[PDB]
Amino acid sequence: GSSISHSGNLYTAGQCTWYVYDKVGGEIGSTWGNANNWAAAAQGAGFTVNHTPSKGAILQSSEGPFGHVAYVESVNSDGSVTISEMNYSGGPFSVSSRTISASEAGNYNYIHI
């Protein structure tokens, strides 16, 4: 018998790929590796990765020490994307706010079912 309730995310207590996973309800993730291996592991798991951030999806790029994933809370009709990335790979619990321009969004992939 295992409770499995106060567990949820297999990640730490403050990771870029931790906050993302919890913000998507655990629909996709876990086996995606980390931010720099996202698109590869996502496709391996069976996700469809494109590159168009949207409300409820996640932002991703391979650039960075661990890559760059940030959960997308909403994409603005202006062409700017409102994402949320906690800790990333540096500041613990730094709920990093970032605004992605459409040009930048063209760089960032996103993995959806």
Side-chain angles (χ1 to χ4, degrees), residues 59-76:
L59 196 83
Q60 188 268 332
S61 191
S62 40
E63 55 170 86
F66 290 83
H68 198 140
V69 299
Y71 160 85
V72 188
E73 297 188 285
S74 52
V75 57
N76 299 269

Side-chain angles (χ1 to χ4, degrees), residues 35-112:
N36 57 27
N37 189 82
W38 247 49
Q43 293 178 330
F47 309 159
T48 316
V49 334
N50 311 330
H51 51 81
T52 312
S54 182
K55 188 171 189 177
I58 313 88
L59 196 83
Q60 188 268 332
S61 191
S62 40
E63 55 170 86
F66 290 83
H68 198 140
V69 299
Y71 160 85
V72 188
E73 297 188 285
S74 52
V75 57
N76 299 269
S77 46
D78 297 283
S80 307
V81 183
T82 298
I83 59 176
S84 51
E85 41 173 85
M86 182 183 293
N87 175 88
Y88 192 96
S89 302
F93 296 101
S94 297
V95 185
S96 184
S97 308
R98 203 183 302 265
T99 308
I100 304 304
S101 308
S103 180
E104 219 62 76
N107 177 40
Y108 293 114
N109 295 329
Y110 88 131
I111 67 175
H112 64 85

